[PDB]
Amino acid sequence: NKKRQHGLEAKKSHILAARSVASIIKTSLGPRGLDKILISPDGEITITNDGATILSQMELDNEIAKLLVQLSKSQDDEIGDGTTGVVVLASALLDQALELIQKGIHPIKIANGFDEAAKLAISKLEETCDDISASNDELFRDFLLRAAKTSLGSKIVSKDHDRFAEMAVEAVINVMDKDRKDVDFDLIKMQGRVGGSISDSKLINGVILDKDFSHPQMPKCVLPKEGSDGVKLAILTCPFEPPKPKTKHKLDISSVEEYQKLQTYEQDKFKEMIDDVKKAGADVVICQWGFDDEANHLLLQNDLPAVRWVGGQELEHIAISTNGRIVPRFQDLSKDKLGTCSRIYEQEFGTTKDRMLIIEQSKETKTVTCFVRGSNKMIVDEAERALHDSLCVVRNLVKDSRVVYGGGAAEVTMSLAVSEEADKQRGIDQYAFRGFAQALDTIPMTLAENSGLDPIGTLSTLKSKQLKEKISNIGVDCLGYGSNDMKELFVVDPFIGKKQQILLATQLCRMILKIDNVIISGKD
Amino acid sequence: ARLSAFVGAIAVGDLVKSTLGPKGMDKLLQSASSNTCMVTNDGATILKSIPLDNPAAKVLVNISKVQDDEVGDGTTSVTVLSAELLREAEKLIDQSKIHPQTIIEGYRLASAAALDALTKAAVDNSHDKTMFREDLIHIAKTTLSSKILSQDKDHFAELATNAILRLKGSTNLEHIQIIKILGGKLSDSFLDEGFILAKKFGNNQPKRIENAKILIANTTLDTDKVKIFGTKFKVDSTAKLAQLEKAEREKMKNKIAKISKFGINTFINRQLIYDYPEQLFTDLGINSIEHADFEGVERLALVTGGEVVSTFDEPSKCKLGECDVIEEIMLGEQPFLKFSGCKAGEACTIVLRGATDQTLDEAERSLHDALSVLSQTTKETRTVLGGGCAEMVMSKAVDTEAQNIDGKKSLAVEAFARALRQLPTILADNAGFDSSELVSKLRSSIYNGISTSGLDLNNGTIADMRQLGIVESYKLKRAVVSSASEAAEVLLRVDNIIRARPR
Amino acid sequence: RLSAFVGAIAVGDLVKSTLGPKGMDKLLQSASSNTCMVTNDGATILKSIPLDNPAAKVLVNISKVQDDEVGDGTTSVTVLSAELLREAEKLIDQSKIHPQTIIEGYRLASAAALDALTKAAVDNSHDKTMFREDLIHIAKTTLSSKILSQDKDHFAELATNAILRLKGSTNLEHIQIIKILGGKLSDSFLDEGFILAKKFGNNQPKRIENAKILIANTTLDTDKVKIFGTKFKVDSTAKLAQLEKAEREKMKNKIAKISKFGINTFINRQLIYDYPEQLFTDLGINSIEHADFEGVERLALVTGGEVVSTFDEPSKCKLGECDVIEEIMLGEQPFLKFSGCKAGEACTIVLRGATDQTLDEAERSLHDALSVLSQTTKETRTVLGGGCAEMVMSKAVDTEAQNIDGKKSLAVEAFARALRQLPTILADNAGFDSSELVSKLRSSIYNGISTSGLDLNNGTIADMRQLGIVESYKLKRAVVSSASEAAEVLLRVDNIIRARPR
Amino acid sequence: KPQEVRKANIIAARSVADAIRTSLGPKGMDKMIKTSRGEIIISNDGHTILKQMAILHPVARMLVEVSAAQDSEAGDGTTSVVILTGALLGAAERLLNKGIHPTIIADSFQSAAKRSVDILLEMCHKVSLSDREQLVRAASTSLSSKIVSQYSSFLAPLAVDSVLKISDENSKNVDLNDIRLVKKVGGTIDDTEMIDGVVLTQTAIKSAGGPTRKEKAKIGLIQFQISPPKEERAYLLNICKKIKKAKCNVLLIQKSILRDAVNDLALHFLSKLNIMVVKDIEREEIEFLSKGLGCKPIADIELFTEDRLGSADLVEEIDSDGSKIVRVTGIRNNNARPTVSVVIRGANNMIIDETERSLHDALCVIRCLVKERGLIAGGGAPEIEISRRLSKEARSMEGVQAFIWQEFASALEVIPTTLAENAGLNSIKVVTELRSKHENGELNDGISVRRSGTTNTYEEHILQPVLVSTSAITLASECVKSILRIDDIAFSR
């Protein structure tokens, strides 16, 4: 079960495979983009326009495509923005290469050209960069928001998405420190409840997890009581109560004395264990198993809410901000072995009776977990993806104040620059540098084709104004506004992101054009 | 691509097309089990029962499943309108070469047009409270249709009308209880505030308890251990085991001491009670009820107004229930217990008097959903003209907005109206009246004034719907447009079907 | 019905691509396959393609009537009539409409459509120059479908000046078209001389002034005129020859009996023998021979002559009159030209093209255009084209749907939907986006502006009055009239019955 | 193709009626069926025919469901409801070919049915359950099938004694489980008993010393069995505390194989307690006993108390030639049921088996007279009578109602046509005479197999309860709707 094909004709097989990958992802590019139906292994129906999930759930058997996907993962992991453009641009770069192959251009002569042409394009893009953070700090916050809405207004939340941008820009403002000059995106957890509306999503200044207090007589809010070590959370596997197995018992009872004798044992272990909560230093107790009712009533006098059947990772997320520990026994617990917060309160959301638990530090917290609602279970999944992506939108805008005015205008601006350097080639490479422009044009072309605009005249419309007039942003009208000028529409992409799109795509040309054999061995 | 993608929706429409209307046709269900012979015009049963292969058709199912829980009615009209919107689009795609997004954008503009028309036709009676009551009869007159109850609808109209008039305030739907009683034609049904339970109270307690104090226990009182549950009877002599149970009887009485600590006249338990702690309830003069299920516990919490009372440590610091009359009666050929005048209870129970099980099964769904529709008419007092009028009213406004709109989008808005004109067409065909004559004569009526006409499918003509009393909900018809608007947006955006590694 | 109506739909598919000056060509392959033809001429397409569905035999015959009757609108009628059937299918399978209901609705709407063509009519009886300018704009449309798309501006003057100078009987026999090899399309010219394509005579006068013309249908070659089974078993060749010489003496007398009329030109349909011809030389008479019926039949009415099949006695016949009879050699071919003929309004269009393969099509092109222009002198009302009339028609049909009963409503709208397919076919064949251009014209005409039409050059919508695209009231009347007739026939067909083939 | 589904449903359903068409009438023909288990049955009983048929077409299975509804509604006419339905389906095929929409057909048949029921009242012979004579006359019609009709005058008032006691004229619904037919092998119909209590299939005591019965005794209704693991008698003696404390002089213990119903020694212990012993009482028979007795079963011996006992006049075992029949008289409990039981005697087991079926039919005859007071003529007289009053009035109907009601009239002739065919008379000659007799003559005229012609069925004493014809029209109109309304057949999952 191996392949046999000799000559450059094998590269025609390889490129024709890439055209299949593109025919999938192509139609997903743009805010007017078309969705894909994803058949889950279990039959679950997922509908998304996100090329990261489209490529992740895309299953193809040609190993050339498996390379294209594995390499595109680096766009999602390092940057997290335009994985879609990596595949779309690469396909066009390979499509123009197919023409170069037939013209007799040696495979390496092709690769050397795309490398030097990228050195021209990225440089000419830098000549047009702009500083989104210029002037005042309040202007930074303003423009930071104006762009964040461009990523959120493209999803189902677009009706009132400004509210998801409210939590996003304010979150990264809380999570970003200009002295640190970096944003640890793991400091933000994405979590919501199934059902609700856009206005039911909240900006939460602290940790919220899918839990509620296990006993209604315990206080829904615990405070340090003016000066204590905040609110400590007990993270244990066993409850504070007389020991009772959760599998089998097998306690032989020989007489009535022995029968009720366990209740005597329970009374001392009831008060001992609930005193061991207070002595151990827990203000609330969360254990993998629940707590005895009589212990629960003895906990009441000390205001010791508790929660049952909770996994370690969920309490870990709290323990990250509170510096808690999973101590094997309650006897070695301390004010520090049990992590500390300032306030734990249980919040009800209108008709939502879930009443989730929120852990705050009564100050600027080291972590936030924002609250997401949406009218359909699957809307919530994508809505949190919008917060994930818009979190990376502002994360890159913090990383690099340099931005480009996008919408295909930067690609056409770079395309025109490549055509300017075409006349300066006057050599064999002139064949290849020109094709780089023909490939750069496929991004604004794809943007127009997914929008319902003229696939050819749109290219001449953008090139006309970006050539005869000025480098002023002349974008694609996919948003349905009046005309071009994304500076007026405040549609902006990160500079470092577009640089990575061009450079990573060039790497894909180095990877695909330099594979001459596909040897697929069997398995024993 | 789209030849394979959108076609999945066409099948969904044909599965439900014949089920819409007062005279609808039935579908037969049968599985490989061979014993699942079901005949129903119910869209919820049909939609949930039919397995579908095309995942795009599975999308329409999930869309309508939301309609079922969100509103409880109109699930047929969502599948019909949403399918006809996609069928008109399939014709636009091939014949005119229309971009998929162009069709999506047109239905968005048309959604605003339809919402304007339904708003213009809103007729409300917050004045003339008597007419609001009559409108509730007329809304039920239309909502109670499509069922095997159609022969007895007039009786069910007054039953549901008083039920919604009984709430006379908050729209709490769980206040409504439905009892399935065998025996008699459906006209024998009656509405009673008694909140009927099928169990009695006490061992020997007086059957009429007035000014009762009801205490609910939610746990197991069969050999009720005072939190020493988990011990074993492990003795070398049988006599010792019986003594161990007497130790439980000491513990049961301590639990009964805490339960009776409240000073109660009546007591209700989720689970069964052992003769001894039950005899203690009997000896203490407490009206004791056992073996209450989820609804027994949940409804009593909403009826009697108390707690599950996990803590019996004090007569206060918790809600204790009350009932004006606890009436034990032999009614419906089954011993019934009736709680009348529960803690500030403004509710009632609807008792269905049917012939057999399958008939009561359908009336359960009919009345369950019927009051669900009426529950929205208290908050939304604006009503809509039925009989297909509103569908034709929308078709006129959509054609009106098509007068002023650009080209690529005008082809979709006009098609949107053609889809709206399929709604009254399916209704007329399922009633067996000339599907072309009736729909066209509707058009001449609505185009040349007369914004009150609709289909008289009982007599086979076109009549003033305000005279015939065919009334719809503003929210119901708005949700038909709204749910269909979102439904089309989802399916029109499908460009391919991608399969991950199947299991 | 399902097959009876659909049977004819294929006919529209054959011609749906022929509509418009930008249209596409059909390739014909003969049974021998070696005589393949490339043409966009719709009448040639419909006549050349055999069709085996009896419903198509009817529609083809319908279009043949329009070819002989009008000479234009072969595609316009065939396409419009096909779209009526394409709409009818949806009125049947998906609607459940009785065939007769469809018939009555199409008749009802055809009346309203005639009214729209009437209300929008514009005529210029005053300012005959403005009528000339409109005739130019009319020719700009009728000259389409040919390679003349490059030189159309010049052929408009060739045809407009002819019908302008006619100023008389619309008989197209007053106008002749000549195909000459050599020259470019623009090298064609208009000549008032109704040129005959042949010179005859041995030593005969080639210049005749104040001529009297005698067209002849007799035998002046040899003897035994209409004598069959007569043989000369003679012992002397003088006994045989004397009888031909006697008929030559009778012709020598008929040359004198002809001469006694006062004749200066003698035109004969048959051959004339050198000697009976030679006697004309001293008489001052140009003798023409072997002129066929096709030519002399029009000369009979252009030169105003007479047939005069019998010359046995003088003063027994009429003659023609011509101011100048001369021989003109152009295109390396001698011609016989006439000037100042009885009924002097005659003229001819002389074509000077590269090859007859191209002239054959331009000949029929101008032939049909002369037919249209002739009719516009009797019906001077004109309408705006480019789909302007078609969309104005659809506007009125919608008005009928405002006030209509229930069964006829679906049919009235179908008639309109067919009218909206007419500008659709135009746009598709022009290669533009028809979904926008049709709805753009729809919004332009529905929201006032009864001026706009399809600009086939720029792919846009503009005023037809400034762009110069106009068509006849009579042409558009025949399009919608024959269309309702075509549907009246085909919609009435329910079953196909076959007598056993012979 | 929605029309083809309806076309297929009619074609398929008509083939079911073609099976039953031959079975109508006392002289009708027999059907043989080889069942899926290999057992070949032969009989003319229509419900038996359809019960063992198991038609695989789900739409045709509805015709079987109607048959059972006819059996539970009236208890007779199980063939008349199927044949009548088939005529509506064949008439519907004509209506469909004439171009009538399914919903127009269905509602028009419903409207014609409303008048049909009224017509049945017009022909009703008014009787009452106080008419002790006609009640026997009605039974003698159904007892014409009796193998030995020399005993028909004994079973006649027997059924009356069962019902006349538990349900007089002031009554609505009679539960045929309240009259339990309990057959006993041997004897003759000279010995039948209307038992005002219950009759048990189990004997009392095989051991000596047994009470065998007790007068003025309390009835134990127990599902919990007494089963031990000195200890043998000690356990049962310890249980004797529960047996005696309840004040129970008769124990009727449910059959259970996990725990012995009555302990082996309990026969002797209860002979000291003077308690009547009955063991191995079939649970399916407890379904009869635990209900009729009016008390409630004991699921735990500790619950065996006084309130859960019956208060019987006498619980006695009848021993005649090895009978030993345990029965109760005078249940007389506050919550009791009007339970009557019939002791059936006959030549051999094959005779008493058939007798039970015929006595069940006789109770269905009276049950028809309880639900619907009044008799109608037999011999298809009501079917011809309706067709005259229907078609005579149908001339005044306007619109499509005239054509559907006229077709309904022709369908009503399927019964007298079938009765004539299976009787061997020219179908045209018979129906023609029936038309002239109902037009000019009496509504009692009909088909007589006794006289070999059409005669007065009232004079020939062929009468039937009106409920059979009213339920036939009712269920048929419901069936023809349910079949015409099937628009598609979908796989379910």
> Which residue matches tokens 């009557």?
D340
Q: Show residues of chain D in contact with B431, CB under 8 Å.
A: 103
CB contact under 8 A, D103 and B18: no
Contact B75, B68 (CB under 8 A): yes
Dist. CA A153–CA B244, nearest whole Å: 70
CA D72 vs CA B17, B361, C204, D468: distances in Å:
36, 20, 123, 11
Same domain, C345 and C385: no
Beta-carbon-side half-sphere exposure of residue B83 (alpha carbons within 13 Å):
25
Read off the amino acid at residue D11: I
What SS3 string covers D373-430? CCEEECCCHHHHHHHHHHHHHHCCCCCHHHHHHHHHHHHCCHHHHHHHHHHCCCHHHH
Same domain, B459 and B476: yes
Beta carbons within 10 angstroms of residue B333's beta carbon: 9
**Encoding tokens for residue B496?**
């391919």
Same domain, A300 and A442: no
Same domain, B375 and B464: no
Domain boundary among C379, C412, C438: C379
- Which residue, among B144, B302, B137, has the nearest Cα to B216 in the 3D structure? B302
* B289 SS3 class: strand
Among B residues 92-131, those touching chain A with beta carbons less than 8 Å apart: 99-102, 105
CA C356 vs CA A440, B133, C179, C353: distances in Å:
51, 89, 7, 7
Same domain, A410 and A477: yes
Read off the CATH number of the domain in which C221 is found.
Answer: 3.50.7.10
Detail the DSSP E strand segments found in D29-163.
31-34, 40-43
Domain boundary among C349, C379, C409: C379
Detail the DSSP E strand segments found in B218-254.
none
Domain boundary among B335, B360, B395: B335
Classify strands D340-344 and D193-195 as parallel, antiparallel or unpaired: antiparallel
Contact B473, B377 (CB under 8 A): yes
Detail the DSSP E strand segments found in B116-164.
123-124
Residues with Cβ within 8 Å of C443's Cβ and at least 6 positions away in sequence, in order, are B404, B405, B406, B407, B410
Burial class (CB in 10 A: 0-12, 13-18, 19+), D34: exposed
Long-range contacts, stretch D448-454, CB < 8 angstroms, 24+ apart: D448/D379, D449/D25, D449/D26, D449/D27, D449/D423, D452/D425, D453/D425, D454/D379, D454/D430
CATH 3.90.1720.10 fits D197-337, yes or no: no
* B165 SS3 class: helix
Angle between helices D466-484 and D80-97 (to 10 degrees): 40
Read off the CATH number of the domain in which B167 is found.
Answer: 3.30.260.10
End-to-end CA distance of chain A: 13
> Among this protein's residues, is C74 annotated catalytic?
yes
**Encoding tokens for residue D78?**
């199980």
CA B487 vs CA A450, B59, B85, B90, C248: distances in Å:
21, 9, 9, 15, 101
Q: Where are the alpha helices (DSSP H) in A430-514?
A: 430-440, 442-449, 457-468, 486-489, 495-512
**H or E segment at D158?**
helix D152-166
CB contact under 8 A, B408 and C447: no
**Encoding tokens for residue A351?**
């008709």
Dist. CA D205–CA D213, nearest whole Å: 10
> Which residue matches tokens 């006992």?
D309
Q: How is the beta sheet containing B123-124 ordered, strand by strand?
A: B123-124, B382-385, B471-473
Dist. CA B392–CA B374, nearest whole Å: 24
The alpha carbon of residue D147 and the mean position of all alpha carbons in its chain are separated, in whole angstroms, by 19
Same domain, A381 and A357: no
Same domain, A234 and A314: yes
Contact C280, C311 (CB under 8 A): no
**Encoding tokens for residue A60?**
């193809």
- Which residue, among D442, D456, D379, has the nearest Cα to D80 in the 3D structure? D379
CA A138 vs CA A135, A142, A170, A364, A490: distances in Å:
9, 6, 13, 20, 16
**H or E segment at B407?**
helix B407-420
Beta carbons within 10 angstroms of residue D311's beta carbon: 17
Question: Cα dihedral sign for A203, A208, A212, A216?
Answer: negative
Domain boundary among A345, A365, A385: A365
Which string of b and e fits C436-460 if b means at least 16 CB within 10 Å? bbbbbbbbbbbeeeeebbbbbeeee
Same domain, C112 and C219: no
Same domain, C194 and C295: no
The residues that bridge with D312 in the sheet, in sequence order, are D217
CA D15 vs CA C31, C150, D11, D47, D85: distances in Å:
58, 77, 7, 16, 12
Same domain, A163 and A310: no
The residue range of the domain holding B177 is 125-201+336-380
DSSP string for A145-212: HHHHHHHHTTSGGGGTTHHHHHHHHHHHHHH-BTTTTB--GGGEEEEE-SB--GGG-B--SSEEES--
Residues with Cβ within 8 Å of D156's Cβ and at least 6 positions away in sequence, in order, are D136, D139, D140, D143
Contact B37, D58 (CB under 8 A): yes
Contact B214, B267 (CB under 8 A): yes
- Which residue, among A197, A230, A256, has the nearest Cα to A340 in the 3D structure? A230
CB contact under 8 A, B247 and A244: no
Torsion angle, alpha carbons of B429, B433, B435, B439, to 10: -110
* B90 SS3 class: helix
Dist. CA D114–CA B105, nearest whole Å: 55
Same domain, C371 and C418: no
B243 CB near a chain A CB, below 8 Å? Answer: yes
- D103, D107, D111, best to mutate vs chain B, most B CBs in 10 Å: D103
Beta carbons within 10 angstroms of residue D61's beta carbon: 16
Q: How is the beta sheet containing D486-492 ordered, strand by strand?
A: B38-40, B26-31, D486-492
**Encoding tokens for residue B143?**
């909502």
Resolution of the determined structure in angstroms stands at: 4.1
Dist. CA B500–CA A298, nearest whole Å: 54
CB contact under 8 A, C442 and B410: yes
- Which residue, among D238, D254, D245, D216, has the nearest Cα to D305 in the 3D structure? D245
**Encoding tokens for residue D269?**
């212990």
Classify strands C460-463 and C452-455 as parallel, antiparallel or unpaired: antiparallel
What are the phi and psi torsion angles at B90 (to 5°)? Answer: -55, -40
In the complex, which subunits touch B with 3 or more CB pairs below 8 angstroms? A, C, D
Q: Where are the alpha helices (DSSP H) in B333-406?
A: 357-379, 389-401
Contact A343, A231 (CB under 8 A): yes
DSSP string for B412-445: HHHHHHHHHTHHHHHHHHHTTS-HHHHHHHHHHH
- Which residue, among B11, B28, B16, B8, has the nearest Cα to B426 in the 3D structure? B16
Contact A325, A337 (CB under 8 A): yes
The domain tally of chain A equals 3
CA B155 vs CA A424, B151, B158, B188, B193: distances in Å:
91, 10, 6, 9, 18
**Encoding tokens for residue B236?**
């070398």
Same domain, A140 and A265: no
Contact B401, B390 (CB under 8 A): no
Read off the CATH number of the domain in which B454 is found.
Answer: 1.10.560.10
CB contact under 8 A, D487 and B26: yes
The alpha carbon of residue A454 and the mean position of all alpha carbons in its chain are separated, in whole angstroms, by 33
Same domain, A109 and A26: yes
What SS3 string covers C303-360? CCCCCCCCCCCCCCCCCEEEEEEEEEECCCCEEEEEECCCCCCCEEEEEEECCHHHHH
Contact D309, D220 (CB under 8 A): yes
Read off the CATH number of the domain in which A174 is found.
Answer: 3.30.260.10
Long-range contacts, stretch D269-273, CB < 8 angstroms, 24+ apart: D269/D236, D269/D237, D269/D240, D269/D243, D270/D210, D270/D211, D270/D243, D271/D205, D271/D207, D271/D209, D271/D210, D271/D211, D273/D240, D273/D243, D273/D244
The residues that bridge with B453 in the sheet, in sequence order, are B464
Dist. CA D92–CA D86, nearest whole Å: 9
Dist. CA D304–CA D310, nearest whole Å: 12
Which CATH architecture does the domain made up of D1-127+374-493 adopt? Answer: Orthogonal Bundle (1.10)
Dist. CA C152–CA C156, nearest whole Å: 6
Classify strands A352-360 and A207-209 as parallel, antiparallel or unpaired: antiparallel
Angle between helices B474-492 and B100-120 (to 10 degrees): 180
Same domain, C250 and C347: no
The residues that bridge with C191 in the sheet, in sequence order, are C348
The alpha carbon of residue B373 and the mean position of all alpha carbons in its chain are separated, in whole angstroms, by 7
Find the length of chain C.
502
Question: Which residues of D belong to the active site?
Answer: 45, 78-79, 361
The residue range of the domain holding A255 is 206-365
> Among this protein's residues, is C101 annotated catalytic?
no
Dist. CA C213–CA B228, nearest whole Å: 143
**Encoding tokens for residue C265?**
């030109």
Contact C35, C41 (CB under 8 A): no
B334: left (phi over 0), alpha (psi -120 to 50) or beta: beta
Contact B26, B41 (CB under 8 A): yes
Same domain, C253 and C110: no
Catalytic residue among A76, A389, A441, A493: A389
Dist. CA B397–CA B115, nearest whole Å: 10
**Encoding tokens for residue D182?**
């309990």
* B351 SS3 class: strand
Dist. CA C222–CA D331, nearest whole Å: 145
- Ordered by start, the domain boundaries in chain D are 1-127+374-493, 128-196+338-373, 197-337
- Which residue, among D452, D404, D397, has the nearest Cα to D424 in the 3D structure? D452
Angle between helices A162-175 and A137-152 (to 10 degrees): 130
Nearest CA in chain D to B51: D493
Burial class (CB in 10 A: 0-12, 13-18, 19+), C358: middle
Same domain, C351 and C329: no
The residues that bridge with B209 in the sheet, in sequence order, are B326
Same domain, C185 and C213: no
Read off the amino acid at residue D485: R
Q: Show residues of chain B in contact with A41, CB under 8 Å.
A: 500-503
Contact D59, D453 (CB under 8 A): no
Same domain, C135 and C117: no
Burial class (CB in 10 A: 0-12, 13-18, 19+), C173: middle
Same domain, A467 and A451: yes
Dist. CA B415–CA B411, nearest whole Å: 6
Read off the CATH number of the domain in which A496 is found.
Answer: 1.10.560.10
Dist. CA B166–CA B160, nearest whole Å: 9
* D279 SS3 class: strand
Q: What angle do CA B180, B182, B188 make, to 5 degrees?
A: 85
Beta carbons within 10 angstroms of residue D98's beta carbon: 12
Q: What angle do CA D77, D82, D84 make, to 5 degrees?
A: 90
Dist. CA D431–CA D438, nearest whole Å: 11
Same domain, A422 and A439: yes
CA C438 vs CA B93, C435, C446, C457: distances in Å:
16, 6, 12, 16
Residues with Cβ within 8 Å of C113's Cβ and at least 6 positions away in sequence, in order, are C393, C396, C397, C415, C419, C480
Beta carbons within 10 angstroms of residue C19's beta carbon: 24
Classify strands A130-131 and A188-192 as parallel, antiparallel or unpaired: unpaired
The domain tally of chain B equals 3
Dist. CA A30–CA A479, nearest whole Å: 9
Chain A residues at the B interface, defined by Cβ less than 8 Å, are: 24, 27-28, 32, 34-42, 45, 47, 49, 54, 57-59, 217, 244, 249-256, 259-260, 262-263, 266, 292-294, 297, 376, 450-452, 480
